[PDB]
Amino acid sequence: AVNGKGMNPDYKAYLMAPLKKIPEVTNWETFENDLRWAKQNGFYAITVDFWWGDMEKNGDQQFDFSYAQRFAQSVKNAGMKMIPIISTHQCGGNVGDDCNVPIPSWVWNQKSDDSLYFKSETGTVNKETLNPLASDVIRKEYGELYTAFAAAMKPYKDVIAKIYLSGGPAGELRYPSYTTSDGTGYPSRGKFQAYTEFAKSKFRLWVLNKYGSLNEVNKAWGTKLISELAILPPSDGEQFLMNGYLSMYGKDYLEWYQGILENHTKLIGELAHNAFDTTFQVPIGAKIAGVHWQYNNPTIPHGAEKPAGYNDYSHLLDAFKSAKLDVTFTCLEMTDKGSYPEYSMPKTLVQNIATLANEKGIVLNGENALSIGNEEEYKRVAEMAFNYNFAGFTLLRYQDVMYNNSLMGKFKDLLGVTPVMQTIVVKNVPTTIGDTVYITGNRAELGSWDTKQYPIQLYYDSHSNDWRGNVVLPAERNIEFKAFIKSKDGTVKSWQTIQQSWNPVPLKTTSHTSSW
């Protein structure tokens, strides 16, 4: 892996449950047996969606956690762990998908205005999640929801491995900028979701708080606004994304726009920490979308990320370290295309989020965006996950490996791995001054034979004159590798005479000694 280190010793693989409830898929007994089969292949937990639309349906605080309870009973019977996702967003909702669980329709009557939903550049209304701008309804409704759930899942705390939160549409912390209804579906650019009277208002009160007076606003934006009512979100998102984003106004609008997400993150992460910390004592996290299309579009750069609210990921992730939340990112199985018309750069995006995240000490969890049909995608996932320090990989979805044994075997081989500590030792290395020793191997956990970005580093032991190093490895898998010397100039001088191997890597901690 990256920075000369190994795979994360805390890597655990997880399975995403289906969208539909288990009794709409199979029965609780073959579900338990499927969970046993999963764990037999390296899955540690099953991550599942518990929808607010189901858990507090009839009215305010007329709660039903019977399904969540029933579901954790089988998880306990199967001797598995689970990761509930308190899904405060809508499931499906439209034509042809495997669910339609709206958010409890009584929520929308808490206000008379438009504080609560979203409206786009062209007037499209979106009601998939509650608008983070309405933080008073969000503190009331989410706080209560979270604590009623902690109360009912307390019997099952020994089966809860972590708790995930929904921060927006599709469980992603972002705005509803890409939808078929708004004419923004992949691979086109999103539209801004700041046109409700309430957002418009909140932008103008923010701007005015920064500058003080309209006069000060016109001074800083180099404009000539008439009234304060002229302080508005962009009227042409296409022009904004084209170049209005470079002006001081543009920079202030996007700071406000991304800022609401950052605040929403500190707020749901506060409410969930209060409610689940004493009782459960588990890591809590939220998800961020991989809006990889229109990344490198020359005309409208980062054309889909900026309407979704992702303008400065370093600053966005900073809201996550402060709220003490883990982050899940989503397209580990994709590669970079970067061409017309989609301008898709997903592998560069995941490499960037991964690096900021490790620089900040935020725990990474990966997810694949789409279903994986071949070994290849699993091998691509293995590369990001193991070379960019992911503490977890959640496979999307259940039925894909559960009703295809060959694919499940490929998963077991590449991603349903258990990390184990091992000492690699290389004797008789002709290391002249300045040189460094590295090992690279065949599996992605050893760098896929790469020597510049991903090799793991070994350190000279002066007492016994060999290069050695405690490497985290895939327990019980066959590995091949070789040591090599990287001269001070980062140049590969030479390699080990004979390629080494461990068939398989023992499950216990040993040492593999070998000579140059």
What is the C-alpha R_g of the chain?
Answer: 25
Q: Residue 92, Cβ neighbours under 10 Å: how many?
A: 15
- The verdict on whether residue 266 carries a ligand-binding annotation is no
Instruction: Tell me the per-residue interface mask from 47 to 86 with Ca ion, x by CB under 5 A, - otherwise.
Output: -------------x--------------------------
Smallest distance from Ca ion to CB 56, Å = 6
SS3 letters across 417-459: CCEEEEEEEEECCCCCCCCEEEEEECCHHHCCCCCCCCCEEEE
Backbone angles phi, psi at 274, to 5 degrees: -60, -40
Contact yes or no for 52/104 (Cβ under 8 A)? yes
Buried b (16+ CB within 10 A) or exposed e, 104-119: beebeeeeeebbbbbb
In the complex, least distance from residue 134 CB atom to Ca ion, rounded to whole angstroms: 14
| CB proximity list for 347: less than 8 A, separation 6 or greater | 331, 334, 335, 336, 380, 384
Known binding residue 152? Answer is no
Orientation angle between helical segments 313-323 and 346-360, nearest 10 degrees: 40
Question: Is 29 labelled as part of a ligand binding site?
Answer: no
Which span (139-147, 218-226, 349-357, 358-366) binds Ca ion, by CB under 5 A? 139-147
Closer residue to Ca ion (CB): 60 or 128: 60
User: Nearer Cβ to Ca ion, position 60 or 375?
Assistant: 60
Size, binding site for Ca ion by CB under 5 A: 3
Tell whether residue 68 is among the known ligand binding residues.
no
64 annotated ligand-binding residue: no
Element (H, E) at 101: strand 100-101
Residue with smaller CB distance to Ca ion, 107 or 194: 107
Under rule CB under 5 A, residue 255 binds Ca ion: no
Residue 64 or 144 having the CB closest to Ca ion:
144
Count of other CB atoms within 10 angstroms of residue 248: 11
Please report how close the Cβ of residue 59 comes to Ca ion at its closest, in angstroms: 9
Give the nearest distance from C-beta 144 to Ca ion in angstroms.
4
307 vs 300: CA distance, rounded Å: 11
Residue with tokens 């034979």: 449
> Residue 26: what are its φ and ψ, rounded to 5°?
-160, -150
**Total Cβ atoms within 10 A of residue 223:** 14
Window contacting Ca ion (CB under 5 A); options: 44-52, 84-92, 142-150, 251-259: 142-150
Q: Is 141 a binder of Ca ion (CB under 5 A)?
A: yes
Give the β-pairing of 419-427 and 511-515. parallel
Is 56 annotated as belonging to a binding site? yes
34 is in an annotated binding site: no
Minimum CB separation from Ca ion for residue 83, in Å? Answer: 23
Which residues are the active-site residues? 172, 367
CB of 84 or CB of 237, closer to Ca ion? 84
Footprint of Ca ion on 143-202 (CB under 5 A): 144
Q: Is residue 377 near Ca ion by the rule CB under 5 A?
A: no
User: Between residues 115 and 389, which has the closer beta carbon with respect to Ca ion?
Assistant: 115
CB of 120 to Ca ion, least distance (A): 28
Region of 468 (left: φ > 0; alpha: ψ -120 to 50; beta: rest) is beta
Could you write out the DSSP letters of every residue in 14-64? EEE--SS-GGGTS-HHHHHHHHHHHHHTTEEEEEEEEEHHHHT-SSTT---
Any binding-site annotation on 397?
A: yes
The binding site comprises 49, 56, 60-61, 89, 97, 141, 144, 287, 292, 330, 368-369, 397
Binding residues for substrate: 49, 89, 97, 287, 292, 330, 368-369, 397
Annotated binding site for Ca(2+): 56, 60-61, 141, 144
Q: Which residues bind Ca ion (CB under 5 A)?
A: 60, 141, 144
